[PDB]
């Protein structure tokens, strides 16, 4: 319980980092698709 009370900001930060990376990858994929259309 309290162990998770200390680790919860770390888990939330890791999830935020993962979501940011995934969003950036999808963004870059769409840009690459536009490049190939060009």
């Amino acid at each position: 319980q309290e162990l998770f009370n200390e680790l919860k900001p770390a888990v939330d930060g890791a999830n935020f980092i993962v979501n940011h990376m995934r969003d950036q990858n999808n963004y870059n994929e769409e840009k690459d698709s536009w490049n190939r259309v060009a």
């Binding site: 998770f4 888990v11 939330d12 890791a14 999830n15 980092i17 993962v18 979501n19 990376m21 995934r22």
Partner: peptide, 22 residues
């Protein structure tokens, strides 16, 4: 403790970051 869905999502996320960078 691992069974918590946020922990599993985080773990899969670290693996995803590693695979994407590879």
């Amino acid at each position: 403790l691992i069974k918590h869905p946020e922990v599993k999502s985080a773990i899969e996320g670290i693996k995803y970051i590693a695979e994407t960078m590879k």
